[PDB]
Amino acid sequence: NKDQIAKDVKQFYDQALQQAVVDDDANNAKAVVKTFHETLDCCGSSTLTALTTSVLKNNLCPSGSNIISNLFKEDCHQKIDDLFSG
Amino acid sequence: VNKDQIAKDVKQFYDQALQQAVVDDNNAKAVVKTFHETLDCCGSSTLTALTTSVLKNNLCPSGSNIISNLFKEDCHQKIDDLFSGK
Numbered sequence: 001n002k003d004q005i006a007k008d009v010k011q012f013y014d015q016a017l018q019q020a021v022v023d024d025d026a027n028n029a030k031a032v033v034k035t036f037h038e039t040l041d042c043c044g045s046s047t048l049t050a051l052t053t054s055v056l057k058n059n060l061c062p063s064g065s066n067i068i069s070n071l072f073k074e075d076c077h078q079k080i081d082d083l084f085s086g
Numbered sequence: 087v088n089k090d091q092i093a094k095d096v097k098q099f100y101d102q103a104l105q106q107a108v109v110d111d112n113n114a115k116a117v118v119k120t121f122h123e124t125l126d127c128c129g130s131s132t133l134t135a136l137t138t139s140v141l142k143n144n145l146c147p148s149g150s151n152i153i154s155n156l157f158k159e160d161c162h163q164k165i166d167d168l169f170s171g172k
Contacts, residue, residue, distance in 0.1 A: 009092060
């Protein structure tokens with residue numbers, strides 16, 4: 001089921017992001033998050049965490065990304081929805 | 087939540103979308119095309135592009151010849167890479 005898998009992937013991402021920003025330990029989290037961000041061209045679960053993440057933990061955001069554009073760009077949840085919806 | 091399970095689920099979802107996409111001929115096509123564009127791949131295996139109607143129907147990323155696909159990673163690998171952090 002599309003919806004369930006989308007939910008699961010978004011949840012997985014959320015976990016990875018929480019770990020990534022909160023604790024430098026759990027080292028895979030950063031990699032997972034950075035690849036999710038690079039793959040989907042986003043920087044957060046929301047524009048708030050995208051904004052919060054683009055600043056202060058920029059090392060895991062895409063290169064071409066203005067902080068103010070992160071405020072307008074789609075979050076990763078939206079991009080995941082887009083991924084699974086087509 | 088579990089990385090392996092979700093990866094399995096996403097790969098399965100993709101497989102379904104791909105089967106529908108190629109065996110038909112329409113939202114399957116969109117899902118598959120976006121998966122392919124997002125992950126830069128064209129099949130569940132290196133063989134699909136070779137045996138299925140993916141290449142025509144314009145379902146592959148730009149400039150993706152049959153040759154290249156045989157030496158590029160399939161979508162399953164890219165999904166694994168996505169969820170593993172590679």
